[PDB]
């Protein structure tokens, strides 16, 4: 029906990763208003949005941690705890839990989901 | 005595909120290149930068959680675990742990620290 209200990962800047967010409006012209998990709002083109909630298992992602901006890993599990999604990210045979907000996609990583989940 | 490499919380303008980041370069004219914890890098005015690392105790902050964008609380503790900073945020007599990345400041909350920690 309508994509309003659905969670997504979307790239809002040219030099940008894909970040967890939520569609809030269909603003026409192939654009949607997005609400990122950090509270920032802006319009984003459909081609720059991946309709993923959660990011699928076996997906290569970037898991953010303090002083780590490019740590790549593979999603191997999801878990709901007190209404919050957690990702189990495998890196070098070891799995660690990350909150939804900390799991992002580089350009190359997002392009692998574009054909199946892009708008 | 330079500011490059120091962690900060810096305003975003579009919404007025201060986010956790790091000064990576002095670009002149009172501006600094800032790398936010999410990996986005841009120039920011010094008056919009708070030299807070960590955000001091008893500060009123906004603590992000899933589908929560305006939940306010008070910092009552800090904890380093595996080289990562965690904030203990009190709200309604209960405390919960948040990672550095999830603790932000609204414009009003950040203005309370401008006098003491701002780079204006
Ligand atoms: C407004 C700025 C430029 C700070 N971010 C916008 C895009 C990222 N939004 C997020 O959801 C997020 C996730 C983790 C950490 C941080 I900081 C932000």
Author numbering:
A (entry chain B): 1484 to 1602
B (entry chain A): 1484 to 1603
From the paper:
The DNA damage response protein 53BP1 (p53-binding protein 1) influences the cell cycle dependency of DNA double-strand break (DSB) repair pathway selection. The localization of 53BP1 to chromatin also requires that it binds histone H4 di-methylated at K20 (H4K20me2) via a tandem Tudor domain (53BP1TT), while BRCA1-BARD1 recruitment requires unmethylated H4K20 recognized by an Ankyrin repeat domain in BARD1. We show that a series of water-soluble small molecules targeting the methyl-lysine binding cavity in 53BP1TT function by stabilizing a previously unknown lowly populated autoinhibited homodimeric state of 53BP1TT in which the histone binding surface of H4K20me2 is buried within the protomeric interface. Our work therefore identifies an auto-associated form of 53BP1—autoinhibited for chromatin binding—that can be stabilized by small molecule ligands encapsulated between two 53BP1 protomers.
Our structural characterization of 53BP1TT in complex with the related compounds UNC2991 (Kd = 3.9 ± 0.4 μM), UNC3351 (Kd = 6.8 ± 0.4 μM) and UNC3474 (Kd = 1.0 ± 0.3 μM) revealed a similar three-dimensional (3D) arrangement wherein each ligand not only blocked the methyl-lysine binding site but was encapsulated in a cavity generated by two 53BP1TT molecules. This consistent burial of the histone binding surface of 53BP1TT by dimerization was unexpected. While crystallization could drive 53BP1TT homodimerization as has been shown for several other systems, that all four 3D structures were comparable despite differing crystallization conditions and space groups suggested that some 53BP1TT dimer may also exist in solution, even though all previous NMR spectroscopy studies only reported a monomeric state for 53BP1TT. Since the homodimerization interface in the crystal structures buries the histone binding surface of 53BP1TT, such a conformation would be autoinhibitory for chromatin binding. Titration of UNC2170, UNC2991, UNC3351 and UNC3474 into 15N-labeled 53BP1TT led to changes in several signal positions in the 1H−15N heteronuclear single quantum coherence (HSQC) NMR spectrum of 53BP1TT indicative of slow exchange on the chemical shift time scale. These chemical shift perturbations were more extensive than could be expected for just the small molecule binding surface and also mapped to amino acids located at the 53BP1TT dimer interface in our crystal structures. Several of the 53BP1TT residues that are close to the small molecule binding site had two different NMR signals. This is consistent with loss of symmetry observed in our crystal structures, allowing interactions by each of the two 53BP1TT protomers with a different “side” of the bound small molecule. Taken together, our data demonstrate that like in the crystal structures, the small molecules are buried at the interface of a 53BP1TT homodimer in solution.
